[PDB]
């Protein structure tokens, strides 16, 4: 291969990668949506950038090897909690270390790969019972 697939298969288990493919494949191919689902089951976090890259190379349906290349793009070794915290800190106008659930929802649903309102609120409610969200703790949590 050309992609860093050996390093992927040291982080994730090849058996799981293969089993999840077989769960979702049709005619020996997997849709991008199901590839992204599998990536998430494996603990990876694809964005729209990752999906669009692979779609532009190979279309909406991936062969096994193309799916492996997609998974390699999803690894994101450079993910860094401080960069995520600083993103939310930008909106912390009063410098309290908290953002309300509504504030967090607005951020998450307005820019980037926008979540739906229900997705955002469900994620926030899963993390905290209270309205003030410690966004440092939230970022530390979501990376795990």
């Amino acid at each position: 291969s050309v992609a860093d697939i050996q390093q992927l298969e040291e982080k994730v288990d090849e058996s799981d990668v293969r089993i999840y493919f077989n769960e979702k494949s049709s005619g020996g191919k997997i849709s991008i949506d199901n590839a992204s689902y599998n990536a998430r089951k494996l603990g990876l976090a694809p964005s729209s950038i990752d999906e669009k890259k692979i779609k532009e190379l190979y279309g909406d349906n991936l062969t096994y090897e193309q799916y492996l290349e997609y998974l390699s793009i999803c690894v994101h070794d450079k993910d860094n909690v401080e960069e995520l915290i600083k993103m939310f800190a930008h909106f912390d106008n009063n410098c309290t270390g908290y953002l309300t659930k509504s504030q967090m929802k607005n951020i998450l649903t307005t820019w980037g790969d926008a979540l739906t309102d229900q997705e955002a609120i469900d994620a926030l409610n899963a993390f905290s019972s209270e309205d003030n969200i410690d966004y440092k703790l939230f970022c530390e949590d979501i990376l795990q």
Partner: peptide, 15 residues
Amino acid sequence: SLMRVQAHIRKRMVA
């Protein structure tokens, strides 16, 4: 960054 946050949230949604 924001897209990374959203990506990890969607990951968490699955497991």
